[PDB]
Amino acid sequence: EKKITGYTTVDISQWHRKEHFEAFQSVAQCTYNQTVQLDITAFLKTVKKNKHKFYPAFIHILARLMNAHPEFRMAMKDGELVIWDSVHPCYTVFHEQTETFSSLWSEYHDDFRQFLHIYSQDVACYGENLAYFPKGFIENMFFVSANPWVSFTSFDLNVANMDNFFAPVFTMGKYYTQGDKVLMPLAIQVHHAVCDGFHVGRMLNELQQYCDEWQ
Amino acid sequence: EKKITGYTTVDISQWHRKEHFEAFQSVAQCTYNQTVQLDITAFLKTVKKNKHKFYPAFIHILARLMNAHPEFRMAMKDGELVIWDSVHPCYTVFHEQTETFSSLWSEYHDDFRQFLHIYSQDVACYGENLAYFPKGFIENMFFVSANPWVSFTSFDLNVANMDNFFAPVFTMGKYYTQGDKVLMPLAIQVHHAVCDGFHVGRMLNELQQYCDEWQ
Amino acid sequence: EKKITGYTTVDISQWHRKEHFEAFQSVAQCTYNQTVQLDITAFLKTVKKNKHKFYPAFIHILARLMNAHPEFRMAMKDGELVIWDSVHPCYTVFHEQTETFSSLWSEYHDDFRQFLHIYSQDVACYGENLAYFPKGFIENMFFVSANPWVSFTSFDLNVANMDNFFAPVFTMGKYYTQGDKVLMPLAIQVHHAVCDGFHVGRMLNELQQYCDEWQG
Numbered sequence: 001e002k003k004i005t006g007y008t009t010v011d012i013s014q015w016h017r018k019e020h021f022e023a024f025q026s027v028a029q030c031t032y033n034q035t036v037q038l039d040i041t042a043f044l045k046t047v048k049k050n051k052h053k054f055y056p057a058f059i060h061i062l063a064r065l066m067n068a069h070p071e072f073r074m075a076m077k078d079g080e081l082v083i084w085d086s087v088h089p090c091y092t093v094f095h096e097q098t099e100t101f102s103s104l105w106s107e108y109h110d111d112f113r114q115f116l117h118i119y120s121q122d123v124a125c126y127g128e129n130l131a132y133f134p135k136g137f138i139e140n141m142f143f144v145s146a147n148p149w150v151s152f153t154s155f156d157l158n159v160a161n162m163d164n165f166f167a168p169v170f171t172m173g174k175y176y177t178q179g180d181k182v183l184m185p186l187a188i189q190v191h192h193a194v195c196d197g198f199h200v201g202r203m204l205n206e207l208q209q210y211c212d213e214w215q
Numbered sequence: 216e217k218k219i220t221g222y223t224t225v226d227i228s229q230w231h232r233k234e235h236f237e238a239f240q241s242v243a244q245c246t247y248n249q250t251v252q253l254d255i256t257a258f259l260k261t262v263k264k265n266k267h268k269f270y271p272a273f274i275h276i277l278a279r280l281m282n283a284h285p286e287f288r289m290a291m292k293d294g295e296l297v298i299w300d301s302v303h304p305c306y307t308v309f310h311e312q313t314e315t316f317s318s319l320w321s322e323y324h325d326d327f328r329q330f331l332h333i334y335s336q337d338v339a340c341y342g343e344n345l346a347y348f349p350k351g352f353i354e355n356m357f358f359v360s361a362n363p364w365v366s367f368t369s370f371d372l373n374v375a376n377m378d379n380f381f382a383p384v385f386t387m388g389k390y391y392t393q394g395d396k397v398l399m400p401l402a403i404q405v406h407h408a409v410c411d412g413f414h415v416g417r418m419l420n421e422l423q424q425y426c427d428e429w430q
Numbered sequence: 431e432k433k434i435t436g437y438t439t440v441d442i443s444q445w446h447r448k449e450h451f452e453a454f455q456s457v458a459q460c461t462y463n464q465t466v467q468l469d470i471t472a473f474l475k476t477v478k479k480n481k482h483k484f485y486p487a488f489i490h491i492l493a494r495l496m497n498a499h500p501e502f503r504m505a506m507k508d509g510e511l512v513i514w515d516s517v518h519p520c521y522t523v524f525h526e527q528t529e530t531f532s533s534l535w536s537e538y539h540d541d542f543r544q545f546l547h548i549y550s551q552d553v554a555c556y557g558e559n560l561a562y563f564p565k566g567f568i569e570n571m572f573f574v575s576a577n578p579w580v581s582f583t584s585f586d587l588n589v590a591n592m593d594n595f596f597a598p599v600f601t602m603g604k605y606y607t608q609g610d611k612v613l614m615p616l617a618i619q620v621h622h623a624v625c626d627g628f629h630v631g632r633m634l635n636e637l638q639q640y641c642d643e644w645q646g
């Protein structure tokens with residue numbers, strides 16, 4: 001019948017980043033991309049040993065991180081800075097016949113068995129649907145762009161209006177063999193009003209960790 | 216004396232990217248850069264075996280792709296989205312004495328011998344002209360920027376105004392040795408309204424393929 | 431006490447890039463990032479031989495380069511294009527206890543022993559001060575950002591308002607081993623009105639050379 005999404009109102013005055021947030025909202029406002037050559041040698045072997053698809057498995061890791069730190073779940077409600085209780089993955093699906101992509105969001109759960117079941121359900125449903133947003137918008141989401149075409153050494157998302165655009169964006173490239181290691185390009189872009197080099201740094205470090213500890 | 220340029224009006228209704236174009240024209244408007252580490256080992260060996268300069272031969276390969284796929288030949292005319300019959304390369308020539316660059320375009324031809332003849336004629340002519348555009352602006356053109364200074368793992372063009380800026384931009388790096396292979400960084404900035412990940416993707420793949428053939 | 435900042439007003443009429451500047455200020459205005467996988471093998475072994483920290487040593491090399499070429503020392507003063515006689519580094523300091531970063535600046539000197547003494551004086555002073563700009567703003571400065579958390583293959587900075595923003599920005603990453611070499615990710619962003627490919631090009635080529643020599 002109905003569902004409500006939860007948030008937390010943050011008073012800037014009590015926040016240790018009050019002066020930074022005020023600056024990257026006005027004078028110093030900027031977004032930044034960064035690309036890493038992620039090692040997924042262990043993440044590939046374990047995914048392939050199991051009856052699993054790479055894409056939703058990696059999605060889950062990302063969402064897990066995104067639901068681990070409040071600096072990623074920030075948005076502007078009614079002119080007020082808030083933190084979502086949870087943030088759901090918006091991922092891209094490619095339609096081979098028409099050469100277009102579509103974006104659909106799955107509901108997030110910590111449990112991987114549960115998340116894949118919701119994912120498969122959404123992809124078995126809207127997977128062949130030609131609409132740009134088969135399910136539509138949801139206030140509390142982050143984005144994952146699949147780029148299986150290019151093993152990129154760089155990726156930069158360059159938006160025209162970045163005002164209040166706090167939702168982080170992942171782009172993942174074509175993985176490849178290098179020595180005894182299998183690496184996958186990963187790009188992350190964020191707003192500086194909500195994310196410092198440190199915030200994105202520890203997440204990307206934990207991103208390596210999780211890709212070396214099962215699904 | 217007089218010539219008229221290619222013009223194909225796209226009616227947005229009959230297009231499979233109707234709402235895609237609509238979104239990236241307003242709400243989600245953005246450009247995106249990707250750098251790749253291009254293999255040119257076979258390309259350099261065949262260019263060096265013949266009497267060709269590296270620069271014009273590569274320009275041709277890019278323009279061969281640019282004129283193979285309509286998504287790269289898109290532009291806004293009189294408030295309408297059109298596709299140019301053909302698009303011509305605009306390259307940068309460096310003036311070492313004054314430490315500045317100029318931009319001049321050459322007329323595209325599918326025959327390489329003929330295009331290099333045009334290129335030779337154009338560079339022999341205006342190569343020492345200190346005007347920013349010694350030949351002027353032209354509607355149907357894409358960009359190539361030379362950067363033999365730096366072997367970059369990243370390059371990002373970052374336009375202040377991206378309204379209707381559908382013309383794609385290449386930047387090529389200082390090539391270098393790595394084992395047996397010769398890598399040259401290449402980077403494309405493209406408007407998202409006209410190009411999706413897939414579009415840039417197949418062209419980079421075809422860019423690789425074409426480099427592994429002859430000139 | 432009192433201090434007058436030196437500059438030189440550039441008349442555009444005589445300048446060889448008058449056409450480019452006018453273009454990259456209106457119609458084709460853009461900034462551009464680029465990341466280089468820097469070879470610091472010789473630079474590390476030299477800094478580690480002495481009792482110097484890596485950060486100030488590198489800060490100095492970048493500043494020595496900005497203050498070498500006028501195209502990095504450009505800005506809009508009172509609606510006019512001026513070149514500062516010198517440009518100072520604004521570097522970042524991370525506070526671990528509160529997980530926020532500050533930005534201070536040290537008056538640049540061509541002599542490394544001198545500079546470091548001022549840098550030390552500033553960090554020993556405001557290194558534990560939790561204000562965003564513990565020293566404040568300065569007309570003539572370039573930016574250096576430490577990113578020791580990620581060994582990035584690409585860093586890209588996208589500013590909202592690039593109007594007249596000619597001050598160059600550096601982002602330096604987590605250095606790592608690659609065979610015999612020790613390489614370190616480095617990004618620069620510049621306004622195309624003040625910087626062409628060649629300017630960034632030679633500075634990064636010189637940056638490699640200055641790293642293969644001594645600390646200063």
Ligand SMILES: O=C(N[C@H](CO)[C@H](O)c1ccc([N+](=O)[O-])cc1)C(Cl)Cl
Pocket residue numbers: 090091092103143144145157159169170171242243244245407411412
């Ligand atoms: O447009 C999408 N993805 C593209 C794929 O190239 C890219 O990741 C992107 C994401 C967000 C965006 N935005 O918010 O303006 C623009 C492009 C969907 Cl995820 Cl909405």
Ligand SMILES: O=C(N[C@H](CO)[C@H](O)c1ccc([N+](=O)[O-])cc1)C(Cl)Cl
Pocket residue numbers: 305306307318358359360372374384385386458459460627
């Ligand atoms: O501006 C030029 N070249 C620069 C050099 O790096 C770059 O390729 C570029 C191309 C197009 C552009 N634009 O139209 O906004 C801006 C920079 C000339 Cl090709 Cl016009």
Ligand SMILES: O=C(N[C@H](CO)[C@H](O)c1ccc([N+](=O)[O-])cc1)C(Cl)Cl
Pocket residue numbers: 028029030192196197520521522533573574575589599600
């Ligand atoms: O905010 C700062 N640094 C960040 C660190 O992520 C970055 O170097 C940056 C530099 C300049 C800038 N600007 O003025 O637009 C914004 C961010 C200070 Cl150095 Cl001003």
